[PDB]
Amino acid sequence: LVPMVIEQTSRGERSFDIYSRLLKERVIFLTGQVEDHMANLIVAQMLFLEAENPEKDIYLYINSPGGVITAGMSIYDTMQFIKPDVSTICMGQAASMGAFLLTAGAKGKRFCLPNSRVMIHQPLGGYQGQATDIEIHAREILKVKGRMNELMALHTGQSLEQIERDTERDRFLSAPEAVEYGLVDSILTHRN
Amino acid sequence: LVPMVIEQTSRGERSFDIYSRLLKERVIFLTGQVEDHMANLIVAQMLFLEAENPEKDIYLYINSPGGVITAGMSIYDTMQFIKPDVSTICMGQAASMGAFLLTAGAKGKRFCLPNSRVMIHQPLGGYQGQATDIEIHAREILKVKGRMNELMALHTGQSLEQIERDTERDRFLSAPEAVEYGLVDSILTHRN
Amino acid sequence: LVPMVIEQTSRGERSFDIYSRLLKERVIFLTGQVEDHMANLIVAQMLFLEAENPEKDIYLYINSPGGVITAGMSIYDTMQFIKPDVSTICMGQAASMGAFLLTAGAKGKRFCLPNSRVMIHQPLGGYQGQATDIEIHAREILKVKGRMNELMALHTGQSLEQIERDTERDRFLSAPEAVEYGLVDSILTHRN
Amino acid sequence: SHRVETGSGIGFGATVKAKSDKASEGELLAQVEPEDLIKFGLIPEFIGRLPVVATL
Amino acid sequence: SALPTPHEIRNHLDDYVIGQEQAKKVLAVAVYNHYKRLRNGDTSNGVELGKSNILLIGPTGSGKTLLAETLARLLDVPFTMADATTLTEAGYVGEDVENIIQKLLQKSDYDVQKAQRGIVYIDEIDKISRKGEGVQQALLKLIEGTVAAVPPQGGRKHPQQEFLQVDTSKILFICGGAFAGLDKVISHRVETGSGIGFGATVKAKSDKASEGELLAQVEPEDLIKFGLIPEFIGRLPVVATLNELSEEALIQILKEPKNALTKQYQALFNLEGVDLEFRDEALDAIAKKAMARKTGARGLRSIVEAALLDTMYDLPSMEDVEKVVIDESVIDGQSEPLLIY
Numbered sequence: 005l006v007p008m009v010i011e012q013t014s015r016g017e018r019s020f021d022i023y024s025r026l027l028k029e030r031v032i033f034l035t036g037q038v039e040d041h042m043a044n045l046i047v048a049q050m051l052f053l054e055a056e057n058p059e060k061d062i063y064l065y066i067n068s069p070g071g072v073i074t075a076g077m078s079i080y081d082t083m084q085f086i087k088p089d090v091s092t093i094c095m096g097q098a099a100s101m102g103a104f105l106l107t108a109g110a111k112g113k114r115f116c117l118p119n120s121r122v123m124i125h126q127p128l129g130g131y132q133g134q135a136t137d138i139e140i141h142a143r144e145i146l147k148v149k150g151r152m153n154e155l156m157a158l159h160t161g162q163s164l165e166q167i168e169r170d171t172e173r174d175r176f177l178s179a180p181e182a183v184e185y186g187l188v189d190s191i192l193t194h195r196n
Numbered sequence: 197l198v199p200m201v202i203e204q205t206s207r208g209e210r211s212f213d214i215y216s217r218l219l220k221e222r223v224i225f226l227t228g229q230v231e232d233h234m235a236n237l238i239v240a241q242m243l244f245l246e247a248e249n250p251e252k253d254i255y256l257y258i259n260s261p262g263g264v265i266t267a268g269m270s271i272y273d274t275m276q277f278i279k280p281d282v283s284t285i286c287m288g289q290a291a292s293m294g295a296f297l298l299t300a301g302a303k304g305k306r307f308c309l310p311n312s313r314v315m316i317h318q319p320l321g322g323y324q325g326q327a328t329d330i331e332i333h334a335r336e337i338l339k340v341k342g343r344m345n346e347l348m349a350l351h352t353g354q355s356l357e358q359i360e361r362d363t364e365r366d367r368f369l370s371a372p373e374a375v376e377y378g379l380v381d382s383i384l385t386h387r388n
Numbered sequence: 389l390v391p392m393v394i395e396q397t398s399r400g401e402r403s404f405d406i407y408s409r410l411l412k413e414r415v416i417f418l419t420g421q422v423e424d425h426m427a428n429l430i431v432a433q434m435l436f437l438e439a440e441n442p443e444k445d446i447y448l449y450i451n452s453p454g455g456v457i458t459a460g461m462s463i464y465d466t467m468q469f470i471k472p473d474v475s476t477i478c479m480g481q482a483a484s485m486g487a488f489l490l491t492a493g494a495k496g497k498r499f500c501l502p503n504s505r506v507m508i509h510q511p512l513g514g515y516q517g518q519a520t521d522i523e524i525h526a527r528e529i530l531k532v533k534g535r536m537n538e539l540m541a542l543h544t545g546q547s548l549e550q551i552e553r554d555t556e557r558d559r560f561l562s563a564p565e566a567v568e569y570g571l572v573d574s575i576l577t578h579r580n
Numbered sequence: 581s582h583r584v585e586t587g588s589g590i591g592f593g594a595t596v597k598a599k600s601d602k603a604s605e606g607e608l609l610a611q612v613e614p615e616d617l618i619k620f621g622l623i624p625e626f627i628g629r630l631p632v633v634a635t636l
Numbered sequence: 637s638a639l640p641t642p643h644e645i646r647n648h649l650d651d652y653v654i655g656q657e658q659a660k661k662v663l664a665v666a667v668y669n670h671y672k673r674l675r676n677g678d679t680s681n682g683v684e685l686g687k688s689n690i691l692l693i694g695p696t697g698s699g700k701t702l703l704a705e706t707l708a709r710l711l712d713v714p715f716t717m718a719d720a721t722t723l724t725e726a727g728y729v730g731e732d733v734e735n736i737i738q739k740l741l742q743k744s745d746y747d748v749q750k751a752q753r754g755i756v757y758i759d760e761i762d763k764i765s766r767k768g769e770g771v772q773q774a775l776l777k778l779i780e781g782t783v784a785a786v787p788p789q790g791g792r793k794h795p796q797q798e799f800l801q802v803d804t805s806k807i808l809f810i811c812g813g814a815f816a817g818l819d820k821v822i823s824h825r826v827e828t829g830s831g832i833g834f835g836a837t838v839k840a841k842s843d844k845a846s847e848g849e850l851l852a853q854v855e856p857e858d859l860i861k862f863g864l865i866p867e868f869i870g871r872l873p874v875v876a877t878l879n880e881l882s883e884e885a886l887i888q889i890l891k892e893p894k895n896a897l898t899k900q901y902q903a904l905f906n907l908e909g910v911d912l913e914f915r916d917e918a919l920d921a922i923a924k925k926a927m928a929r930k931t932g933a934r935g936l937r938s939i940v941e942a943a944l945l946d947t948m949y950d951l952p953s954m955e956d957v958e959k960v961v962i963d964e965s966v967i968d969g970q971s972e973p974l975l976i977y
């Protein structure tokens with residue numbers, strides 16, 4: 005199913021996977037719903053690349069409809085913790101968590117294709133149980149909402165008040181509009 | 197089961213899968229429904245092929261019943277971004293995304309088989325929730341339709357109004373009719 | 389479980405799969421219901437075989453109960469496009485799609501086993517929705533029906549009227565009867 | 581041919597399938613270059629001593 | 637006979653070689669030293685001056701062999717060459733490394749003094765690397781001094797009954813080769829390690845300078861990644877990189893060199909009494925043809941010869957013709973050089 009490729013060098017020939025071959029070039033793919041299993045794999049890729057060369061940038065291609073917050077924040081904290089700068093490129097779609105991980109890239113290295121859509125909204129949740137338990141979970145998700153908005157305003161450069169109103173409901177943004185909000189820095193249309 | 201093939205080279209004999217072997221010849225297969233996982237695989241192949249020779253054409257065989265617009269646009273943007281021209285060949289069926297990706301190839305390199313069927317229609321979708329949310333999603337999909345029609349008119353050459361009326365409902369086109377509409381440039385009947 | 393076979397040559401011993409080993413001998417297997425994934429696999433094999441020797445004949449074994457019309461046409465167009473002649477051999481059963489690809493082989497190189505069964509009928513389909521949409525699909529399938537009959541008459545050598553009357557309903561033809569109809573040329577009984 | 585072969589090896593009409601099919605013979609030999617002789621197995625000094633070549 | 641100073645060696649080398657300014661200086665002092673020592677056995681002390689080998693890492697048809705050949709011609713000493721791919725370890729059918737010593741002596745005309753002051757030129761050093769290693773182990777010793785038995789065959793079957801032994805610690809081993817891929821290895825160490833992606837740098841802008849500037853930053857570690865054993869690199873202290881011949885270079889090469897192709901044809905036509913001219917427009921087009929087919933500098937002769945073949949077949953059988961002006965259309969084959977008498 006997954007095609008295989010070969011890398012010809014003076015040493016010889018080595019059979020590599022299409023995704024593994026790109027990993028050598030410091031390229032990570034964030035595809036599908038965000039979860040603990042896929043997020044852990046992405047974290048491992050970042051740490052491995054850091055060991056090879058802590059001075060070379062890492063490219064993260066984001067195309068996902070969103071997912072779990074905890075799994076996503078693990079990647080965010082891992083991108084800011086590692087010394088190398090992480091460049092984010094939006095391909096096709098970037099939802100609530102995907103957009104948060106898009107604007108979280110290094111300044112001047114956040115790109116987006118022209119025919120791309122970006123969506124941002126407040127986190128979702130729920131809990132069934134006793135009233136006192138609902139208050140605990142209800143109060144906790146509110147902190148995440150404010151905590152996430154504070155980070156979006158920091159990376160995007162907007163104000164917390166503007167982010168709160170915009171993230172109240174689903175807000176779709178195109179590539180040119182994302183640049184204005186600060187979610188990305190440039191649009192890639194053609195090579196050179 | 198995917199058959200294996202042997203490639204004789206200077207170093208000796210190398211084993212490849214039927215799909216991987218054709219990838220070495222700059223041939224990419226777009227089969228089945230278009231989704232995020234499948235689209236990212238095609239993107240990785242395009243980027244990979246660009247590195248060996250940015251001046252050699254890339255062949256994309258399209259046979260699919262359609263798919264999500266977001267994933268398709270990722271492939272469309274990648275095709276236009278990479279320097280080498282992408283030749284699109286239609287075999288079997290080509291739906292909304294298949295036809296859009298079929299006409300997005302390099303001018304003069306869009307081929308189609310004589311008994312191939314091409315279908316084009318407007319985007320599909322939906323949303324369940326509050327009226328305020330429905331309005332947001334309703335306007336979002338409407339912009340996508342206009343953005344898609346604008347691109348379709350550019351490659352085909354037809355006027356925007358004609359593309360709009362013709363895409364109000366499912367429109368089936370054969371290989372000769374596709375040439376008249378501008379979705380393809382030639383028909384491949386026999387070798388040479 | 390597919391067994392592994394050994395090929396002895398003056399290059400080194402190589403273990404091959406039973407299906408992959410026969411691919412080297414210009415033999416392609418067409419088994420099960422015809423669909424897009426298997427159709428694209430057969431197409432890839434044909435393009436690979438003509439690269440090794442575009443003059444030698446390609447053998448296609450057909451044992452299938454039919455399948456999608458679009459998937460079959462992909463194989464048909466590929467067969468009539470490649471320079472080498474495609475020899476079709478019917479073992480077991482050959483339904484509507486299997487029979488079309490059977491009679492589509494090179495003239496004088498279509499074979500059938502003595503106890504093989506052949507069946508031909510008009511295409512199937514269906515659509516649920518608005519009346520306007522039904523008329524669009526109703527006319528589309530009718531065009532395919534006429535297109536398939538025209539191609540069937542060309543290879544079988546019969547008249548278009550006879551094909552329409554005979555394909556109105558299921559028609560079972562044994563190996564000796566298929567020779568008279570024109571779907572095949574000869575019958576293979578023993579290795580002479 | 582390999583030196584003057586451009587395009588893929590496997591594919592539809594776009595691809596060149598002439599590899600085996602004999603179309604012209606003198607044409608390829610006429611465009612012979614010393615570089616080709618290297619691949620054939622002739623040391624560069626020897627092919628460099630013979631500047632002229634006459635295709636028959 | 638005072639040795640030629642480095643400047644003199646460079647100024648002259650320019651005449652027959654256009655470009656490669658850095659490599660010219662490297663190969664100027666390296667030879668000025670390799671001979672300044674040989675002519676002074678002692679060192680007014682107990683020191684024993686060593687040898688410094690040269691590693692010519694350049695692209696194909698760049699002037700690697702030419703530089704080694706033209707440098708030996710400036711002086712009067714023997715010149716030999718070889719091919720690493722035509723050697724194998726001991727015990728195997730493959731030609732032994734000692735054979736190279738034989739060829740060296742033959743060119744020396746059965747002499748030791750000359751052979752001791754010879755400049756062998758191994759080539760195609762690449763492609764015999766790891767996964768090869770055995771062939772690189774034998775050469776590793778010859779390059780840093782070894783006495784070798786020279787089979788006594790040749791001039792009077794080499795009368796010397798001691799197999800005419802020769803010390804291989806005074807022969808300048810100019811081991812060259814076109815390390816295809818080193819440019820990428822170096823790029824992953826001196827710039828972004830991403831070759832594939834939307835933010836990478838694909839080499840499609842006809843940047844012929846890229847290979848030259850990249851190779852200039854070569855380091856021993858880069859060669860290790862290429863496969864070359866650490867020991868072999870150590871034996872070759874001097875390294876000189878060559879740039880890639882561009883369109884301007886070829887144009888200059890067709891006119892500037894003392895032995896330029898243009899001058900050659902001009903000389904023979906002058907013997908017949910007819911003059912020959914080469915319009916600058918024609919020259920640049922010829923260069924573009926070479927890059928198109930990637931024939932290189934070696935293919936220039938073929939192009940010009942083909943365009944002058946018919947002309948040569950008619951000049952001796954004609955009269956009153958005293959001048960020819962090759963035009964841009966003559967080379968492509970759509971025109972015939974006008975005879976203005």
Ligand SMILES: Nc1ncnc2c1ncn2[C@@H]1O[C@H](COP(=O)(O)OP(=O)(O)O)[C@@H](O)[C@H]1O
Pocket residue numbers: 652653654655694695696697698699700701702759814881889893933934
């Ligand atoms: N700078 C140059 N000046 C003149 N001739 C050159 C130059 N570079 C290459 N050549 C031509 O190329 C040929 C030698 O190629 P060479 O450099 O030996 O290739 P390689 O480096 O692969 O051995 C000679 O015939 C020579 O005329």
